[PDB]
């Protein structure tokens, strides 16, 4: 997964990430609540003034940056309840025996002159006997408490500028200076409780992210090395520590994220600074109204143009990246996977295609993941290989070619093909997969899409065009009396089957179970499915399709005009070709994808060509 951390594995890293985000969100006390609500209603163009009014004053369902407005919800109570729902309770200065400054919330404040506007939350997770099992340390980003917002933010910005232009390793030392004493009290508290450093989660966003990186940097030599093995997840940090301890997560179109290299100010710092970085997720796009807008992007992308800062906002971090965590495609992703997150306002969502524009970034490589919202989305895949997820809502998908998985989610979803039905072939395994094959042999595996839209020659002999909506049914695509037939098929069962192709060619659908698929002299398309499947060509120009946890298969009779297609399979690093996955075992080429494999019986690896082995 994109958020794998150390050696915790897929599932445990996701749980750690969700805790990091929860404590980070808590540290801002819903300061951006009004902004997120105004944006969602008004967007970022014509509605920008109205969005900014809500950012300041909230409304009846949000609280902006100004406190004490009687019709706003108590957004700070809501942030406290949300952090507790995630399992966390702030730890008091009294429980720590801490002598420094806290406010009425329990937020701890920086310890030295020049750091007095630094804030950190210290939180505890407790088991059912009320024993402490985990400590959360969440540094606040730029900003402070509503009571002192402006003066506190000035002090933060002075710190931000010293990171770039002050003493060498100002950023490294930030946490030592701001919270050196507090962190000794935390070590004592942890030890008193049977905890070590491994039981400590360290997080924060922006300046809070720089703080995560500072702390990792210092954890080797300060506080007795107690935190050397702590967990460090930083959001939208301008800096990266010199250690291997930090997961630096952010949106690539967030101008603050990676602004420094890893604390050095460069030419790039004021512009696009999207060079690959080892500790960082380099290719996650926030598809918001600004990113989508032609007008807004006439302006140079820069940390110095404030409207680009919409991509920095913490709520869209929490909301977008939670959708990545929940994605049915999550375990296909890796640290530098290209992921586009649908983050449009309500008005923009209704008329803007979520797609990879590749704006203000280095060229995206490998497959592209596009993650929709729980509302009605318009999602556009490119001409390469895409993983499109609609989620809830009535979603519409388009795609420009290649090999794709398209998950409609709940709702009434539609695939608009934008061309004639006659240029496509359609197959259906009866297990909820509708396969769509374009004129170039590109295949989309689709689920939960009930309507197919095509564009057909229309009046005056094709001068005008008809949009035709087809319903996906068991017997084919139907418009009124007109049925578009599925491609000839043989369907198996979820037990062990033997299926035989007819001579004109069939799609063979083994489904679950160890299946024997016998092709003929025709062009057959082999879908072994789950289980360990034996598949024999029979001759012709065959396609073998591998998706998900496809097991250990054997392919007999594979020749030069045949094709393997790996779609939604484990372990594909961005832009892998087959050689990254291929080895000879005796007489056979073996291709491995996670714990799944395909054995090409009798085929020399040296005869194989990227033409006939599609890895998406």
Q: What is the binding site for its own copies (CB under 8 A)?
A: 45-46, 48-50, 52-53, 56-57, 65-66, 148-151, 154, 157-158, 161, 295-296, 298-300, 304, 306
Locus of tokens 């025709």 = 522
Nearest to its own copies of 9, 300 (CB atom):
300
Active site residue 206: yes
Nearest to Ca ion of 272, 479 (CB atom):
272
Segments in 250-371 forming alpha helices (H) = 289-292, 314-325, 346-349
**539 known ligand binder:** yes
**542 known ligand binder:** yes
Cα distance between residue 490 and residue 510, in whole Å: 8
Nearest to its own copies of 67, 87 (CB atom):
67
Nearest to its own copies of 55, 123 (CB atom):
55
Percent helix, strand, coil in the chain (nearest 5)?
A: 25, 25, 45
Residue 239 Cβ, how far from its own copies at the closest point, in Å? 20
**193 known ligand binder:** no
**392 known ligand binder:** yes
**281 known ligand binder:** no
Residue 121 interacts, among its own copies, Ca ion, none and using kind-specific CB cut-offs from 5 to 8 Å, with none
Alpha-carbon torsion, ordered 578, 580, 581, 586, to 10 deg: 100
Cα distance between residue 210 and residue 257, in whole Å: 10
Verify binding: residue 301, Ca ion, rule CB under 5 A.
no
CA proximity to 344, closest of 300, 402, 269, 285 = 285
Which residues have C-beta within 8 Å of that of residue 543, sequence separation ≥ 6?
Answer: 441, 443, 523, 524, 525, 526, 562, 563, 565
Among 34, 510, 568, 612, binds Ca ion (CB under 5 A): 510
Q: Given 27, 62, 203, 206, which residue is catalytic?
A: 206
Helix (H, G, I), strand (E, B) or coil at 318: helix
Radius of gyration of the chain (CA): 27
**391 known ligand binder:** yes
Handedness of CA 563, 336, 203, 200 (dihedral sign): positive
Region near Ca ion per CB under 5 A, out of 158-166, 183-191, 212-220, 335-343: 335-343
Verify binding: residue 596, Ca ion, rule CB under 5 A.
no
Verify binding: residue 250, Ca ion, rule CB under 5 A.
no
Nearest to Ca ion of 58, 409 (CB atom):
409
* Alpha-carbon separation of residue 127 from 79, 133, 189, 498 (angstroms): 22, 6, 16, 53
Residue 128 interacts, among its own copies, Ca ion, none and using kind-specific CB cut-offs from 5 to 8 Å, with none
Residue 395 interacts, among its own copies, Ca ion, none and using kind-specific CB cut-offs from 5 to 8 Å, with Ca ion
Residue 353 Cβ, how far from its own copies at the closest point, in Å? 20
Cβ neighbourhood burial of 67 (10 Å; 0-12, 13-18, 19+): middle
Q: How many CA atoms lie within 13 A of 504 on its CB side?
A: 4
Residue 533 interacts, among Ca ion, its own copies, none and using kind-specific CB cut-offs from 5 to 8 Å, with Ca ion
Cα distance between residue 589 and residue 564, in whole Å: 13
**401 known ligand binder:** yes
Q: Are 538 and 518 spatial neighbours (Cβ–Cβ below 8 Å)? A: yes
Residue 148 Cβ, how far from its own copies at the closest point, in Å? 7
Q: Are 263 and 234 spatial neighbours (Cβ–Cβ below 8 Å)? A: no
Residue 48 interacts, among its own copies, Ca ion, none and using kind-specific CB cut-offs from 5 to 8 Å, with its own copies
Q: Which are the catalytic amino acids?
A: 206
Residues near Ca ion, by CB under 5 A: 117, 119, 144, 152, 156, 252, 274, 280, 282-283, 336, 361, 372, 377, 381, 386, 390-391, 393, 395, 399, 402, 404, 408-409, 411, 413, 492, 497, 510-511, 513, 515, 519, 524, 528-529, 531, 533, 537-538, 540, 542, 550-551, 553, 559, 561-562
Q: Binding site residues for Zn(2+), as ranges?
A: 127, 131, 516, 536
């Amino acid at each position: 997964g994109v958020y794998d951390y150390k050696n915790f594995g897929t599932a445990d890293s996701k749980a750690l990430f969700s805790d990091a985000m929860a404590i980070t969100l808590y540290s801002y006390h819903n300061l951006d609540n009004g902004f997120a609500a105004g944006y969602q209603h008004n967007g970022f163009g014509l509605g920008l003034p109205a969005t900014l009014v809500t950012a300041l004053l909230g409304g009846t369902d949000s609280q902006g940056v100004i406190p004490g407005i009687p019709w706003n919800p108590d957004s700070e109570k809501l942030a406290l309840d949300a952090v507790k729902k995630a399992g966390w309770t702030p730890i008091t200065a009294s429980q720590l025996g801490y002598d420094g400054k806290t406010d009425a919330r329990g937020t701890f404040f920086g310890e030295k002159a020049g750091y007095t506007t630094a804030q950190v939350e210290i939180l505890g997770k407790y088991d059912a006997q009320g024993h402490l099992t985990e400590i959360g340390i969440a540094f606040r980003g730029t900003s402070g408490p509503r009571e002192n917002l402006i003066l506190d933010s000035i002090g933060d910005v002075i710190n931000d500028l010293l990171a770039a232009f002050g003493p060498k390793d100002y950023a490294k030392n930030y946490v030592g200076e701001a919270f050196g004493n507090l962190l000794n009290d935390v070590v004592a508290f942890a030890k008193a409780n049977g905890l070590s450093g491994k039981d400590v989660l360290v997080s924060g966003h922006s300046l809070g992210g720089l703080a995560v990186n500072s702390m990792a940097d210092l954890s080797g030599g300060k506080w007795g090395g107690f935190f050397a093995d702590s967990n460090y997840i930083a959001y939208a940090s301008p800096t990266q520590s010199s250690t291997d301890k930090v997961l630096n997560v952010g949106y690539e179109n967030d101008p603050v994220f990676r602004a420094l290299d890893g604390s050095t100010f460069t030419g790039a710092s004021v512009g696009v600074h999207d060079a690959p970085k080892e500790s960082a997720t380099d290719n996650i796009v926030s598809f918001n109204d600004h990113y989508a807008s032609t007008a807004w992007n006439l302006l140079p992308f820069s940390i110095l143009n404030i409207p680009t800062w919409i991509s920095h906002l913490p709520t869209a971090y929490g909301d977008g990246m939670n959708r990545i965590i929940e994605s049915k495609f999550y375990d296909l992703t890796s640290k530098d996977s290209t992921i586009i997150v649908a983050n449009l306002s309500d008005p923009a969502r209704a008329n803007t295609w979520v797609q990879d524009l590749n704006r203000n970034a280095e060229t995206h490589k490998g497959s592209t993941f596009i993650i929709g919202s729980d509302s009605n989305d318009l999602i556009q895949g490119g001409s390469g290989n895409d993983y499109l997820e609609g989620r809830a809502g009535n979603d519409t998908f388009r795609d420009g070619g290649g090999y794709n998985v398209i998950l409609g989610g709940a709702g009434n979803n539609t695939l608009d093909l934008q061309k004639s039905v006659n240029t496509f072939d359609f197959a259906n395994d009866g297990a909820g997969n509708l396969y769509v094959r374009d004129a170039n042999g590109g295949i989309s595996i689709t689920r939960d899409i009930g309507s197919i839209v095509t564009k057909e020659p229309g009046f005056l002999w094709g001068l005008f065009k008809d949009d035709v909506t087809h319903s996906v049914t068991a017997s084919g695509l139907k418009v009124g009396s007109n049925v578009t037939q599925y491609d000839a098929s043989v369907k198996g069962t979820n037990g062990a089957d033997t299926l035989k192709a007819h001579a004109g060619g069939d799609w063979l659908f083994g489904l679950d179970g160890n299946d024997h698929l016998i092709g003929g002299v025709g062009n057959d398309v082999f879908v072994g499915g789950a289980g360990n499947d034996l598949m024999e060509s029979g001759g012709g120009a065959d396609t073998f399709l591998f998706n998900g946890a496809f097991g250990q298969d054997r392919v007999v009779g594979f020749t030069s005009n045949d094709k393997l297609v790996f779609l939604g399979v484990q372990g594909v690093l961005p832009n892998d070709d087959f050689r990254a996955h291929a080895s000879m075992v005796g007489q056979d080429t073996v291709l491995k994808f996670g714990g799944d494999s395909v054995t090409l019986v009798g085929v020399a690896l040296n005869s194989l060509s990227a033409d006939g082995i599609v890895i998406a």
